[PDB]
Amino acid sequence: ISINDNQRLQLEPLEVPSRLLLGPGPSNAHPSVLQAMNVSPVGHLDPAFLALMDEIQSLLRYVWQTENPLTIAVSGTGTAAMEATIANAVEPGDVVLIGVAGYFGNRLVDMAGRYGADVRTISKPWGEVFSLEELRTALETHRPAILALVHAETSTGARQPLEGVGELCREFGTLLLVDTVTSLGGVPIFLDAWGVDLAYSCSQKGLGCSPGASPFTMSSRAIEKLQRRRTKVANWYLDMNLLGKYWGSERVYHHTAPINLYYALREALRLIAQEGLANCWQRHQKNVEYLWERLEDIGLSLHVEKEYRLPTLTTVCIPDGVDGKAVARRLLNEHNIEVGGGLGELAGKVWRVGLMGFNSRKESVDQLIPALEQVLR
Amino acid sequence: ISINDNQRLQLEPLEVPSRLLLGPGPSNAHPSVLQAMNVSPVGHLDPAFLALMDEIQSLLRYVWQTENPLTIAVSGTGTAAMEATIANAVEPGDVVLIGVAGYFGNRLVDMAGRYGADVRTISKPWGEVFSLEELRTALETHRPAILALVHAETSTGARQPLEGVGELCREFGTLLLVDTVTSLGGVPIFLDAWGVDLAYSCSQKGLGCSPGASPFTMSSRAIEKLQRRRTKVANWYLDMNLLGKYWGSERVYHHTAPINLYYALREALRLIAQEGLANCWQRHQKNVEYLWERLEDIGLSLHVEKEYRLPTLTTVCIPDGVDGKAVARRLLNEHNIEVGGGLGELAGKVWRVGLMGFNSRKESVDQLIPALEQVLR
Numbered sequence: 001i002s003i004n005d006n007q008r009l010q011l012e013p014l015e016v017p018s019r020l021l022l023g024p025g026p027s028n029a030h031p032s033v034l035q036a037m038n039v040s041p042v043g044h045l046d047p048a049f050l051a052l053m054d055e056i057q058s059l060l061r062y063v064w065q066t067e068n069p070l071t072i073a074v075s076g077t078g079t080a081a082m083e084a085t086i087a088n089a090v091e092p093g094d095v096v097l098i099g100v101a102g103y104f105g106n107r108l109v110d111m112a113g114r115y116g117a118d119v120r121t122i123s124k125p126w127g128e129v130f131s132l133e134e135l136r137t138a139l140e141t142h143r144p145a146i147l148a149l150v151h152a153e154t155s156t157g158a159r160q161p162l163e164g165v166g167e168l169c170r171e172f173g174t175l176l177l178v179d180t181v182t183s184l185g186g187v188p189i190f191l192d193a194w195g196v197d198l199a200y201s202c203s204q205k206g207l208g209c210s211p212g213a214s215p216f217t218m219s220s221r222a223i224e225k226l227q228r229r230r231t232k233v234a235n236w237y238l239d240m241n242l243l244g245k246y247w248g249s250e251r252v253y254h255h256t257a258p259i260n261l262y263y264a265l266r267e268a269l270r271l272i273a274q275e276g277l278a279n280c281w282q283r284h285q286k287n288v289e290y291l292w293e294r295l296e297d298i299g300l301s302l303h304v305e306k307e308y309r310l311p312t313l314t315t316v317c318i319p320d321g322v323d324g325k326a327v328a329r330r331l332l333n334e335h336n337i338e339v340g341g342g343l344g345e346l347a348g349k350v351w352r353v354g355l356m357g358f359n360s361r362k363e364s365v366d367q368l369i370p371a372l373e374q375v376l377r
Numbered sequence: 378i379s380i381n382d383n384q385r386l387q388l389e390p391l392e393v394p395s396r397l398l399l400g401p402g403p404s405n406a407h408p409s410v411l412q413a414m415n416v417s418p419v420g421h422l423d424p425a426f427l428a429l430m431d432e433i434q435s436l437l438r439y440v441w442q443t444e445n446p447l448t449i450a451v452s453g454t455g456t457a458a459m460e461a462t463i464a465n466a467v468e469p470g471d472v473v474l475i476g477v478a479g480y481f482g483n484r485l486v487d488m489a490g491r492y493g494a495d496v497r498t499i500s501k502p503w504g505e506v507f508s509l510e511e512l513r514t515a516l517e518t519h520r521p522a523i524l525a526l527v528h529a530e531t532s533t534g535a536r537q538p539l540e541g542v543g544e545l546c547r548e549f550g551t552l553l554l555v556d557t558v559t560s561l562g563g564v565p566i567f568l569d570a571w572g573v574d575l576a577y578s579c580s581q582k583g584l585g586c587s588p589g590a591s592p593f594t595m596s597s598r599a600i601e602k603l604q605r606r607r608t609k610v611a612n613w614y615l616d617m618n619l620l621g622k623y624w625g626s627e628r629v630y631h632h633t634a635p636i637n638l639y640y641a642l643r644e645a646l647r648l649i650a651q652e653g654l655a656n657c658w659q660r661h662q663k664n665v666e667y668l669w670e671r672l673e674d675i676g677l678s679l680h681v682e683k684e685y686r687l688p689t690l691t692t693v694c695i696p697d698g699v700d701g702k703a704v705a706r707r708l709l710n711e712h713n714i715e716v717g718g719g720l721g722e723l724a725g726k727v728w729r730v731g732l733m734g735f736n737s738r739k740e741s742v743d744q745l746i747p748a749l750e751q752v753l754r
């Protein structure tokens with residue numbers, strides 16, 4: 001057997017265009033976070049690395065406002081942490097109620113069915129949110145093991161209020177499972193106060209990091225549920241029975257953690273802890289309000305009712321007579337700015353402007369706006 | 378609700394010890410690969426990033442010696458790519474035969490059962506390998522849908538010969554599924570010539586990269602099997618029906634790829650293509666032979682029969698009267714060298730010396746040997 005060199009490409013060292021990433025994700029990581037990746041690795045079970053993990057756990061507890069012991073990073077993107085909440089919480093035949101008001105609601109429906117759930121849904125138009133009474137009626141009707149909601153719907157620009165939801169779930173014996181991929185770091189979240197039982201996020205948005213070290217947490221109620229499973233978790237890579245032994249004191253090998261991505265996450269969290277949560281939320285809200293003003297200035301309208309608008313993701317209506325995809329391509333190629341287009345019920349009807357983490361700054365809006373104006377001429 | 382700052386750690390910028398990583402994994406990534414992570418991200422669907430992915434696919438085809446279209450990186454460590462082969466190949470009730478001759482054989486048994494397989498095993502003492510006749514007898518007995526083998530058993534130091542195995546599997550209508558986590562880049566592999574149907578590797582060993590961008594491939598026979606599934610793949614993050622649409626021309630969003638880790642993988646593969654496969658295999662074999670000599674020089678013996686010794690992972694016997702764990706701790710703390718200890722049948726009986734990728738160099742052995750001598754005094 002001789003070596004086949006047909007796909008032996010002769011490449012030059014990496015060169016990539018510069019992009020201001022103002023879409024649904026990923027965002028531009030902070031420069032110090034990128035530098036932290038360029039550090040020699042140590043072993044995934046080296047006491048220094050374990051010390052670093054301990055630091056990531058503490059800082060994730062701070063940033064999410066939880067004291068859950070099982071608060072870790074998953075070695076995968078937001079979808080992996082998402083799937084881990086489903087795999088660890090759902091046993092075949094469990095009734096799982098999903099509030100669907102956007103693309104990620106539908107993804108939750110798909111995932112839950114793959115773990116054998118009896119899937120129930122309630123729906124709102126994309127950009128709208130569920131009331132307490134709507135949720136109560138759905139809990140009455142479906143009597144589910146789990147209620148899943150997306151806190152910050154990246155596909156619609158809406159923030160789902162969660163006050164009273166945990167208490168409501170406790171009345172029905174239901175676990176509360178919440179997507180905070182687009183809220184963590186940029187929108188106030190109080191997981192414990194809200195009685196959330198499983199939550200997940202990502203590293204590439206409010207946290208100002210590269211994708212792939214995705215926050216995950218489980219409450220005591222959620223662990224109790226995991227503990228009574230009749231079968232093993234049907235996902236080996238995401239089985240919290242095993243991951244809990246690596247992140248816990250047993251320090252049992254499960255997988256070789258992505259050393260350099262954890263370096264980056266620890267540095268990203270350090271930067272958030274330095275700024276301070278309150279300040280971070282304030283920055284994101286101030287920046288989004290400037291965005292809304294500049295957009296109004298140039299005659300563009302907003303999709304989502306003011307009260308529920310995400311500071312991290314704004315849906316802007318596409319005017320009649322405007323090709324939304326063409327505008328987005330021209331922004332990318334002529335201006336090096338990424339923005340998102342609409343999906344599903346919002347296909348062709350909105351753009352999606354991300355203002356997250358390191359990109360939540362005035363300079364972002366100041367690049368976007370005159371670029372948008374020139375493209376809309 | 379006021380903000381709780383109890384876990385708001387006040388940290389200084391990242392500082393980690395230097396370590397020569399000569400254990401089972403991860404290895405020290407090459408400096409240019411680490412530098413490539415420190416580059417601003419672009420979007421996961423930006424044509425420049427898609428171009429980069431196209432490059433990763435071509436170079437993975439070269440390095441693995443396959444022409445499979447579905448050859449990609451999985452956004453997870455070796456365990457994720459491992460699990461993806463199982464999730465995409467196994468339907469409930471499928472008979473799955475695993476050749477268990479080490480720790481990763483047992484992990485395959487565990488995974489397969491979680492996807493509903495009817496799991497069958499054959500066993501060899503750790504450090505030994507299966508013959509063609511042993512495999513034939515097992516295929517006769519179990520008539521399995523899938524035969525799974527570990528090419529390079531990191532827990533034992535043995536290389537499983539695969540010549541004739543694909544032809545044997547075709548006689549029985551069986552798919553061949555192979556772990557190449559510890560062989561890819563450092564040990565000759567000819568996937569297509571060997572008739573392998575699913576394979577997986579990792580990015581942190583022979584490829585000289587950071588963990589988390591793990592090679593995965595499926596043959597046409599394996600895709601045919603996937604295509605006749607009666608149910609969805611029971612793993613959303615690893616479902617090749619969906620990942621195939623991101624890595625293929627449809628370019629449909631599945632997950633936000635770990636941009637900076639793919640930068641690193643593309644650069645790692647570029648470096649291997651520059652060196653050339655033959656040269657890379659030759660380097661690893663020359664370096665391991667120097668290792669064996671220096672170890673003999675200092676009176677240490679080898680566990681594995683010469684013919685099956687891995688160039689990338691050597692099991693060295695622990696002499697009577699020597700505390701293997703204590704030696705390993707002293708190497709780490711007094712000498713900044715990581716080596717592995719034994720597990721399972723080899724607990725307390727072997728150390729495991731990795732010589733992989735960037736660490737497959739004379740300087741590695743030259744650090745290790747006098748350190749080992751001083752520690753053994």
Ligand SMILES: Cc1ncc(COP(=O)(O)O)c(C=O)c1O
Pocket residue numbers: 024025077078079080082104150152153154155179181182202211631632633634
């Ligand atoms: C609300 C929401 N949930 C889940 C995800 C999936 O995360 P990932 O793309 O990192 O896999 C995203 C993607 O950004 C998202 O916006």
Ligand SMILES: Cc1ncc(COP(=O)(O)O)c(C=O)c1O
Pocket residue numbers: 254255256257401402454455456457459481527529530531532556558559579588
């Ligand atoms: C043979 C083998 N298979 C699978 C794995 C799992 O890879 P990871 O630790 O990257 O999840 C390893 C770990 O190095 C291994 O040595």
